[PDB]
């Protein structure tokens, strides 16, 4: 600024004051350009954070309203442009297309196809620049919500509207898991309780197309894509795009939320997003901070996440359940933003690879995993069996305590350990394994009531599949019932037991 236009060309005419007179106000000439940062001279009158439009067609946005020029993050190329290029105002900040036809659709973060399903239709467009709802506008989470993963639904019993951190490592199947959850939502979407229909928004944040491609392919396979947006900021992305993607997502899901719908956004992951943004700030020489990160990216997110909610029905009728993902790298949440984030959600979900290495998908460090919420995010159902199990794993862990000290100190515990092992078997949960609760509790019940202590741990699982098919086939009645009861009923138990015993008996013998 202090050089440019103090030096000629630019300056060289301002002198006269003849140079459109000046204008460049609803126009700009690219003052300097390099590298997706169009310092654009002019655009002078501008809104704040206006998305502007390029002579290369393209967008960039005038975030930085400087008194001279506009720091424009150009969301892309520099090989198009060469300086002085005309930037025409749009007078307008971003709002993003939103709609419900995005359900069934993979778009880029532009909310434009990449799907190669031709184009999407854009019904609505809706602000990304839209704030979070209010207290009363929210009615807190009531629901449960099944990922179809006993462990998950049990130990983090999730409702909807809920902001909750998914955290876990590098392609560790975590994402597989995340998919499986998503797969689970299918049944609800094949169900008809809208309130159990969770519209999935998979924000792919900086996640390379190839990586998307299989994955999407997987979604295709699940067909569940039909109620699913895949908001796609792949790795290739211009940073503002990757960056942008959540806010975009944010407009759409709140929309759903507000359209009564219970929306789910999977942000995978903001760790990357942040890089992109940070990078963006920093490039603007809007300097870094802790962990090189400048800090109101948190505000960005805090606010972002404040936009995820469970609406008071009078106030929205729906939910946007936010399942952010931060993919930890070495489980690292020392990671600034994780430290922050830890401070942000109403629990966070810890994954432990080791279980994974043990084979055990899931990975979980349950001990560290939390839904503080838990129960607001649940139902009667699970609690009746699960409480004890959690506790019992506490015990199991406890004798792993005394595996920080030891291997044997009680008979009981030789049993308890046995029991513990049993509980472990159940917690091995395949990837691509979406469930209904009744199964989840079902499978829990025998063992947690001891009757699977009576079996080879490896075979528990075997039982379970088999068992499942048994009831499915047989006790379909019941399955209807437990499902009816939305809980485990005395009847169901007893009958369950009876079944169980028979099944158990057939499996065990």
């Amino acid at each position: 600024k202090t050089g440019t236009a103090e030096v000629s060309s630019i300056l060289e005419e301002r002198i006269l004051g003849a140079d459109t007179s000046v204008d460049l106000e609803e126009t700009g000439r690219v003052l300097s350009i390099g590298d997706g940062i169009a310092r654009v001279h002019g655009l002078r009158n501008v809104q704040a954070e206006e998305m502007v439009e390029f002579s290369s067609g393209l967008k960039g946005m005038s975030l930085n309203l400087e008194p001279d020029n506009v720091g424009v993050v150009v969301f892309g190329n520099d090989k198009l442009i060469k300086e002085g290029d005309i930037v025409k105002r749009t007078g307008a900040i971003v709002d993003v297309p939103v709609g419900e036809e995005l359900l069934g659709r993979v778009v880029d973060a532009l909310g434009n196809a990449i799907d190669g399903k031709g184009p999407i239709g854009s019904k609505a467009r809706r602000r990304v620049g839209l704030k979070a709802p209010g207290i009363i506008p929210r009615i807190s989470v009531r629901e449960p919500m099944q990922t179809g993963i006993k462990a998950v639904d049990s130990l983090v019993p999730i409702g909807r509207g809920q902001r909750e951190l998914i955290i876990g490592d590098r392609q560790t199947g975590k994402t597989s898991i995340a998919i499986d959850t998503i797969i689970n939502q299918k049944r609800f979407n094949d169900g008809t309780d809208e309130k159990k229909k969770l519209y999935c928004i998979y924000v792919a944040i900086g996640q390379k197309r190839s990586t998307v491609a299989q994955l999407v392919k997987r979604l295709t396979d699940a067909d569940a894509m039909k109620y699913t947006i895949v908001v796609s900021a792949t790795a290739s992305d211009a940073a503002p795009l990757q960056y942008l993607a959540p806010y975009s997502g944010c407009s759409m899901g709140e929309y759903f939320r507000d359209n009564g719908k219970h929306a789910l956004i999977i942000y995978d992951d903001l760790s990357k997003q942040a890089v992109a943004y940070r990078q963006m700030s920093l490039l603007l020489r809007r300097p870094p901070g802790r962990e090189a990160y400048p800090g109101d990216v948190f505000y960005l997110h805090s606010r972002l996440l404040e936009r995820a909610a469970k609406m008071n029905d009078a106030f929205g009728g729906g939910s946007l359940t936010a399942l952010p993902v931060i993919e930890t790298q070495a489980g690292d949440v020392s990671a600034y933003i994780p430290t922050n984030v830890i401070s942000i959600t109403d629990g966070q979900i810890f994954l432990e690879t080791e279980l994974f290495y043990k084979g055990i998908r899931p990975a979980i460090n349950v001990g560290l995993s939390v839904s503080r919420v838990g129960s607001a995010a649940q139902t009667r159902a699970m609690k009746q069996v699960a409480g004890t199990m959690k506790l019992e794993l506490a015990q199991y862990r406890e004798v792993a305590a005394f595996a920080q000290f030891g291997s044997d100190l009680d008979a009981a515990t030789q049993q308890l350990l046995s029991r513990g092992v049993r509980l472990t078997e159940l917690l091995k949960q395949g990837q691509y394994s979406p469930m209904a609760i009744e199964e989840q509790v079902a499978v829990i019940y025998a063992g947690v009531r001891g009757y699977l202590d009576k079996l080879e741990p490896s075979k528990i699982t075997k039982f379970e599949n088999a068992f499942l098919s048994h009831v499915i086939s047989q006790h379909q009645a019941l399955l209807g019932k437990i499902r009816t009861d939305g809980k485990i009923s005395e009847e169901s138990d007893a009958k369950l037991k009876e079944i169980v015993t028979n099944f158990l008996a057939g499996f065990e013998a």
């Binding site: 030096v7 000629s8 060309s9 300056l11």
Partner: protein, 167 residues
């Protein structure tokens, strides 16, 4: 925007980033010289405080400092784009800096085609020289002046020290 035009000297820009504007500006429209003289004038037209010292006084509002220092006065016949650049250096506070732009400038239509080599005493004395021919010698002859020991010395001009300098 424009395209590069720079009178001989020419310069480096930078407090002459303006100069260079007018090394294209003045140059173009070729009131090159009009302003060339303007500048000269300005120099002392400048030099006395007043509505100028005004700036110094931070608390005088630049806004109206321009409308005073340049309104009635610096447009006294300094205007074309000249008041506007005044009013630019004005804004851009490059007013205390302005002399140097003139300096910089003024080696411009004349001195634009200056004389450089660094030469003992009152060395070169910006003129004009044509590199194909010698011009050097001539000059020297003209004078049998300068100071050359006090002024530039037999060490440069012919190493008084060097014989010392080997050891």
């Amino acid at each position: 925007f424009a395209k590069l035009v720079r009178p001989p000297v020419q310069i480096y820009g930078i407090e002459g980033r303006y100069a260079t504007a007018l090394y294209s500006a003045a140059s173009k429209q070729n009131k090159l010289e009009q302003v060339e003289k303007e500048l000269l004038r300005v120099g002392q037209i400048l030099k006395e405080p007043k509505m100028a010292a005004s700036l110094l006084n931070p608390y005088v509002k630049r806004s109206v400092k321009v409308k005073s220092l340049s309104d009635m006065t610096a447009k006294e016949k300094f205007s074309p784009l000249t008041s506007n650049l005044i009013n630019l250096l004005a804004e851009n506070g490059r007013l205390t800096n302005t002399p140097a732009v003139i300096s910089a400038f003024s080696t411009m239509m004349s001195v634009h085609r200056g004389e450089v080599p660094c030469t003992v005493t009152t060395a070169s004395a910006l003129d004009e020289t044509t590199l194909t021919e010698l011009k050097t010698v001539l000059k020297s002859f003209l004078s049998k002046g300068q100071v050359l020991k006090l002024e530039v010395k037999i060490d440069p001009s012919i190493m008084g020290g060097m014989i010392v300098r080997i050891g």
